[PDB]
Protein backbone atom coordinates (compact mmCIF):
# COMPACT_ATOMS: atom_id res chain seq x y z
CA UNK A 1 0.00 0.00 0.00
CA UNK A 2 1.13 3.72 -0.72
CA UNK A 3 0.65 6.47 1.33
CA UNK A 4 0.40 9.77 -0.43
CA UNK A 5 1.86 13.23 0.87
CA UNK A 6 3.58 12.20 4.24
CA UNK A 7 7.32 11.89 5.51
CA UNK A 8 8.99 8.67 6.53
CA UNK A 9 8.69 10.00 10.46
CA UNK A 10 5.13 10.32 11.99
CA UNK A 11 4.36 6.27 10.85
CA UNK A 12 4.14 2.75 12.61
CA UNK A 13 3.92 -0.26 11.53
CA UNK A 14 3.40 -3.85 13.25
CA UNK A 15 2.95 -7.50 12.78
CA UNK A 16 -0.22 -8.70 13.89
CA UNK A 17 -1.58 -12.34 13.16
CA UNK A 18 0.36 -14.92 14.88
CA UNK A 19 -0.63 -18.77 15.36
CA UNK A 20 1.39 -19.79 17.96
CA UNK A 21 1.69 -19.85 22.05
CA UNK A 22 3.94 -18.25 24.62
CA UNK A 23 5.43 -18.23 27.89
CA UNK A 24 4.19 -15.23 29.99
CA UNK A 25 7.80 -13.62 30.73
CA UNK A 26 7.56 -10.47 33.27
CA UNK A 27 10.03 -9.34 30.24
CA UNK A 28 7.42 -8.78 27.41
CA UNK A 29 4.40 -6.86 27.72
CA UNK A 30 0.95 -8.18 27.78
CA UNK A 31 -1.73 -8.63 24.58
CA UNK A 32 -4.64 -7.11 26.65
CA UNK A 33 -6.33 -5.69 29.93
CA UNK A 34 -7.52 -9.63 30.79
CA UNK A 35 -5.29 -12.36 29.27
CA UNK A 36 -6.43 -15.16 28.24
CA UNK A 37 -5.47 -18.90 28.70
CA UNK A 38 -4.85 -21.44 26.36
CA UNK A 39 -2.73 -24.22 28.11
CA UNK A 40 0.11 -25.32 30.52
CA UNK A 41 3.01 -27.08 30.83
CA UNK A 42 4.77 -29.50 33.60
CA UNK A 43 7.62 -28.67 35.98
CA UNK A 44 10.33 -31.88 36.05
CA UNK A 45 12.82 -33.24 38.15
CA UNK A 46 11.04 -33.39 41.19
CA UNK A 47 12.57 -34.10 44.81
CA UNK A 48 13.43 -37.30 46.89
CA UNK A 49 15.34 -38.94 50.13
CA UNK A 50 18.70 -40.65 50.06
CA UNK A 51 21.99 -41.03 51.60
CA UNK A 52 25.29 -39.66 51.48
CA UNK B 1 0.69 10.06 28.52
CA UNK B 2 1.81 6.63 29.12
CA UNK B 3 1.35 4.81 31.86
CA UNK B 4 2.27 1.03 33.37
CA UNK B 5 0.83 -1.22 36.19
CA UNK B 6 2.52 -3.97 37.70
CA UNK B 7 1.25 -6.56 40.40
CA UNK B 8 2.80 -9.07 42.52
CA UNK B 9 1.93 -11.69 45.59
CA UNK B 10 3.01 -14.12 47.66
CA UNK B 11 2.77 -18.20 47.98
CA UNK B 12 4.36 -21.35 49.18
CA UNK B 13 6.77 -23.70 47.71
CA UNK B 14 5.93 -27.52 46.34
CA UNK B 15 9.25 -28.72 48.37
CA UNK B 16 7.31 -27.97 51.99
CA UNK B 17 6.40 -32.01 51.77
CA UNK B 18 10.10 -32.67 52.20
CA UNK B 19 12.12 -30.14 54.17
CA UNK B 20 10.44 -28.86 57.03
CA UNK B 21 10.13 -28.03 60.63
CA UNK B 22 7.68 -29.03 63.18
CA UNK B 23 6.77 -27.37 66.17
CA UNK B 24 5.25 -29.15 69.31
CA UNK B 25 3.73 -29.09 72.74
CA UNK B 26 5.27 -31.69 75.56
CA UNK B 27 3.30 -33.02 78.80
CA UNK B 28 4.31 -35.66 81.05
CA UNK B 29 5.66 -38.79 80.08
CA UNK B 30 5.34 -42.44 80.79
CA UNK B 31 8.40 -44.72 81.48
CA UNK B 32 9.18 -48.46 80.95
CA UNK B 33 12.06 -50.88 81.72
CA UNK B 34 13.68 -54.12 81.33
CA UNK B 35 15.82 -56.43 83.93
CA UNK B 36 17.44 -59.67 83.85
CA UNK B 37 17.28 -61.71 87.08
CA UNK B 38 19.03 -64.73 88.62
CA UNK B 39 16.67 -67.56 89.99
CA UNK B 40 17.56 -70.62 91.04
CA UNK B 41 21.10 -70.54 88.45
CA UNK B 42 19.71 -69.56 85.35
CA UNK B 43 19.22 -65.91 84.07
CA UNK B 44 15.61 -64.72 82.96
CA UNK B 45 14.30 -61.74 81.27
CA UNK B 46 11.50 -59.39 82.47
CA UNK B 47 10.33 -56.24 80.61
CA UNK B 48 7.16 -54.08 82.29
CA UNK B 49 5.92 -50.83 82.78
C1 LIG C 1 11.10 -38.72 52.57
O1 LIG C 1 10.41 -37.96 51.57
C2 LIG C 1 9.01 -37.81 51.84
C3 LIG C 1 8.42 -37.06 50.66
O2 LIG C 1 8.95 -37.56 49.44
C4 LIG C 1 8.78 -37.10 53.17
O3 LIG C 1 7.39 -37.09 53.48
C5 LIG C 1 9.55 -37.79 54.30
O4 LIG C 1 9.46 -37.04 55.50
C6 LIG C 1 11.01 -37.98 53.91
N1 LIG C 1 11.72 -38.70 54.96
C7 LIG C 1 13.00 -38.46 55.27
C8 LIG C 1 13.58 -39.30 56.38
O5 LIG C 1 13.67 -37.61 54.69
C1 LIG D 1 23.99 -66.46 82.75
O1 LIG D 1 24.17 -67.23 83.95
C2 LIG D 1 25.53 -67.62 84.17
C3 LIG D 1 25.54 -68.51 85.39
O2 LIG D 1 24.77 -69.69 85.18
C4 LIG D 1 26.41 -66.38 84.32
O3 LIG D 1 27.76 -66.78 84.47
C5 LIG D 1 26.26 -65.47 83.11
O4 LIG D 1 26.97 -64.26 83.33
C6 LIG D 1 24.78 -65.16 82.85
N1 LIG D 1 24.64 -64.38 81.63
C7 LIG D 1 24.89 -63.07 81.57
C8 LIG D 1 24.68 -62.42 80.23
O5 LIG D 1 25.27 -62.43 82.54
Given at each position: ???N???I????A ?15 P ?23 | ????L????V??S ?7 A????A ?6 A ?11 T????
Open positions: KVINCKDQCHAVTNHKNWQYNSPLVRNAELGDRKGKIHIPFPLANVTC | ENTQSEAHEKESCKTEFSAYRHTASASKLRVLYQGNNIVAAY
